[PDB]
Amino acid sequence: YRYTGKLRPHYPLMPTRPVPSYIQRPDYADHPLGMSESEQALKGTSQIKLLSSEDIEGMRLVCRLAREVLDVAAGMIKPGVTTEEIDHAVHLACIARNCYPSPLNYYNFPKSCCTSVNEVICHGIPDRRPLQEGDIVNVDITLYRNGYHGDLNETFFVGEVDDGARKLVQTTYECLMQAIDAVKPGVRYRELGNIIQKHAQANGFSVVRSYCGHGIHKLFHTAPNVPHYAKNKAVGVMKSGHVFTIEPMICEGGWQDETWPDGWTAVTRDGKRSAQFEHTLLVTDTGCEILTRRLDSARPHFMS
Template sequence: MFKKIDEIIHKATIDRGAYPSPLNYYKFPKSVCISVNEVICHGIPDKRALKEGDIVNLDISCYYNGFHGDMNATYCVGKVDEKGVQLVNTARECLEKAIAMVKPGIRYRDFGKVIEEHAKKNGFSVNRTFSGHGINQLFHCAPNVPHYANNKAIGIVKPGHCFTIEPMICEGGWRDEIWPDDWTAVTSDGKRSAQFEHTLLVTEDGCEILTK
């Protein structure tokens, strides 16, 4: 199943004259990241099949006309328990609340406070290892955009800046571990994680969501 999803995304990207940004990026072997349940991010597609009750994140990035775009979303497979649905909804809401803040003059460190407050209000935590990032002709670049409160990110949002916000919301604790494949990040306590992401271009009075 995962292998098939990767093949579909690869073909759809190439057919549109683009290139899948993850493929061969620091030796990442596939065209999409697929992260299920306790996998926080950077899951490598394999022969595994989805099952009823899973939550699955598809992180799709492409390079087109000299620029990268990056977005992801988490989906419920069949009937998911109430806590799982709440986790997915909270992750989406965290992103929406952060996007609503984006305008010139905001500090990059300020997004994390709003995200973490909403996550904690719903009984969840925010992963601190992985952050949003600048994106343009480079796949990952400055600025660093943490998703947790009291972070030390530097910089002020200005017109023309392009970056992602992509909070990873955890059902249990925020800590993570990396599998021996050097890519797959999972929650240390084995509990689930959900994530949503958009690429944002800062305008004179707000932002444009480039990955809608």
């Protein structure tokens, strides 16, 4: 395999971390290949679930807990810390909140969160590499509690970063918020990509096309599929009660991605940097509730 940039995986990986049996597990947690039968049963369907008041309370809870766990990871970002150490802290923080870390064994993913450094677009696997000053790193968190999944992610700066890193991260966050500001009943899911690409393009950045936002609730990834690029064929119109994520991955260079031999790590084909931000949103009668928002601080960590 020919690596696209300077990053290399740092093996060996620690043995998979167990989750106490008292914590409720999603169906794929105990499937040998990590397959989710409940999810697969709806593969290819575009119908979007309309959450009940009960489902909404469950989503509000898990999303708040997920934010708490991402905040824990945020506090650990510093030069010298390995992504496996961040993952260990996330795993324990999920357990402390009586939640199962959704990524764990999802289609056999080996860790409890995704840590994506520099040219890694997404799905980076926590390993032995210590973070380096100047790096940008995304931590993607998803928790499962009482049958509901809550998902969010932020990109962080490791020590002092260059102006290019600052612009990429700020722009990506702005792309996400402009999309969220457009969410309300009656809006087509395909419009979000037009908004995101317009802002990214105005700043000289590209939009990853192989990975999209997704419906999330009783399932980790389900309808609707939400592309972040312009002129996409996303199916569906927003309605109060819909819950889904917006998680644009923006790149310094081209939008093309490829996957490492580990089967998970997605990287830019040109080796340039990529940044991402994500929130889980609930469409209300008039707009949307950002379930994974910070409740005690006005801004994301990179600008805090």
